[PDB]
Amino acid sequence: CPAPPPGSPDIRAIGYYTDAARSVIDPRLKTQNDAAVKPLNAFAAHVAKFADAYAKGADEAAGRCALTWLDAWARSGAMLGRMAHVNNDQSDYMRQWTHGAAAMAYLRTQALASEQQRTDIETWLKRLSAANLAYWDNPKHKRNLHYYWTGVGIMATAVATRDDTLLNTAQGIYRAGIDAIEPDGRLPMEMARKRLALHYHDYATAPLVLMAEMARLQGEDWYTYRQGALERLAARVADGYRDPSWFNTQSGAVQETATPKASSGWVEFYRLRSPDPMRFDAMHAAGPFQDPRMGGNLTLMAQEGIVPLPQ
Numbered sequence: 001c002p003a004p005p006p007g008s009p010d011i012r013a014i015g016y017y018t019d020a021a022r023s024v025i026d027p028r029l030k031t032q033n034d035a036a037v038k039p040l041n042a043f044a045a046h047v048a049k050f051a052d053a054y055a056k057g058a059d060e061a062a063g064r065c066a067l068t069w070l071d072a073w074a075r076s077g078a079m080l081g082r083m084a085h086v087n088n089d090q091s092d093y094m095r096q097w098t099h100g101a102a103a104m105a106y107l108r109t110q111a112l113a114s115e116q117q118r119t120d121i122e123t124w125l126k127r128l129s130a131a132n133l134a135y136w137d138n139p140k141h142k143r144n145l146h147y148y149w150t151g152v153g154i155m156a157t158a159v160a161t162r163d164d165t166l167l168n169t170a171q172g173i174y175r176a177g178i179d180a181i182e183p184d185g186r187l188p189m190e191m192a193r194k195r196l197a198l199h200y201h202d203y204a205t206a207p208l209v210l211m212a213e214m215a216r217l218q219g220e221d222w223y224t225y226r227q228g229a230l231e232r233l234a235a236r237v238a239d240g241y242r243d244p245s246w247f248n249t250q251s252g253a254v255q256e257t258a259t260p261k262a263s264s265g266w267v268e269f270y271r272l273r274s275p276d277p278m279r280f281d282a283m284h285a286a287g288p289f290q291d292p293r294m295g296g297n298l299t300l301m302a303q304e305g306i307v308p309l310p311q
Contacts, residue, residue, distance in 0.1 A: 001065035002046075005039050007078030011095055013037050015088030022088075023194045023253075033090060040094050041292075043073065044101035048296035051108040055300065055308040063109040070106055071117045074124035080131060092135050093146050097293045099128040099153030100207075104295035104306075107160040107214075111310040125157040129166055144189040145204035148177045152207045152294070155214045167218060174211045177204070178226050185232035186250060197251035198240040202264055205234055209266040210294050212273075213306065223273055234270055238279045265289025265298030272302065 013036050016029035034041075047066045054063030073079075079098060083091040103125050106113075113121070132150050135141060151173035158166035180187055190200035208230060215222040223230065240247045244255040260267070260283045268289060271280040288299035295301060 001061065001068055004046075004069040004072040005043060007043070007073035007076040008039070009077045009079065009081030010083075011037075011040065011079060011081075011091040012084040012086075013091040013094050014084075014086050015090040017088060021192055021194055023196045029087070037090075037094050040079075040098045043069065043078075044098055044292035047105035048101060048290075048292035051105045052290075052296040052300065054109055054112075055297075055304060057308070057311075060112060060311065063112040066105050066109045067113050067117050067121070070102055070121045073102070074120040077124070080124075080127055083135075089135075089141070092132075093149075095128070096132050096135075096146060096150045096153065099125070099132055100149065100156065100294070101153075101292045102128075103153040103156035103160065104293075107156045108295060108307055110160055111307075122157075122161045125153070126161065126163065126166070129154045129157050129169070133169060142189065143176060143180075145187075145200060145207070147173060148204055148207040148211075149293075151177075151211050155211045156295075159214050159217050167215075167220075170211060171215075171220075171222065174208060174215075174222055175225055177208045178229050181226075181229040181233045183232075185236040187233065191247075191250050194251050194253035195256045197253070198237065198244060198247045198255045199258060201233065201240065201247075202237045202260070205230075205237055205270075206263040206266040206291075206294065209234075209270050213269050217306065231274055231276075234267075234274065235276065235279055238267070238283055241283055260286040260289075262289060262291040263294060265291060265294065265302075268298045268302035 014033055016026050016033050018024050018026045047069050050062045050066035053059050079095050083095060106121055132153060136147060151170045154166055155170035158170050187201055187204055190204050191197050193200045212222045241260060247255050264283060267280045267283045271277045271284055290297050295306060
């Protein structure tokens with residue numbers, strides 16, 4: 001188990017989008033953003049890799065390594081300090097996403113946690129939940145897919161700590177997303193993203209699906225909430241990768257050419273739930289999918305279950 005990197009209380013990330021619709025890249029600011037947020041992305045990637053290795057079986061040391069890393073950032077109060085707002089709110093988005101990665105890794109490995117590790121990590125995850133939630137108390141923070149992604153960390157924290165009030169908080173975020181889906185499947189705030197409209201519909205679907213899967217672990221069937229809406233959105237995404245005609249028309253721009261990757265791996269879960277699974281065959285074939293922000297290997301979790309059976 002390698003030594004965990006430093007976990008700073010603060011995040012000083014800088015945005016890279018240079019248009020109002022947030023679909024034009026400043027490649028220099030992007031590259032400088034990937035360097036300022038490197039410790040966060042690398043922490044996420046490691047705890048997800050450790051959790052995946054634990055889930056293969058006969059590797060309890062991997063699960064304990066995840067918990068050593070999580071405990072270390074809990075003890076240093078990582079990400080509980082100041083959030084810089086420069087160019088946009090990329091710092092808050094990184095606190096949302098990294099909370100999600102840490103919470104998922106804990107949810108997957110917590111069977112191996114010592115009692116002190118439980119107290120440290122769960123207190124940290126619940127504080128991250130409160131901090132990330134409070135960000136959205138300002139109504140000028142528009143609740144697009146970043147709001148839905150905020151639900152990932154809150155929900156994995158809720159399930160892992162058996163905190164029903166946090167569970168209901170995540171439910172409100174999930175339901176807010178489902179409620180935003182229009183009758184034809186559009187999410188208007190993501191359709192405003194021009195050439196990235198398909199991309200952002202794809203990445204808005206991912207946290208909703210994952211939250212619904214986690215809810216199954218608590219005995220709740222969130223997939224039935226306004227049943228029909230999530231399928232409409234998910235089918236548009238699959239259709240879009242097959243034929244971007246609809247996204248071209250609805251968004252007013254030719255979609256960037258892209259193939260499903262990483263967070264697109266929500267399809268690994270949803271193809272087992274949909275009334276029309278074969279629509280997702282081509283996205284499924286683009287796998288396997290890995291996203292630390294969603295707990296790691298989505299292809300394997302969809303068939304194994306999110307939380308491996310403890311030895």
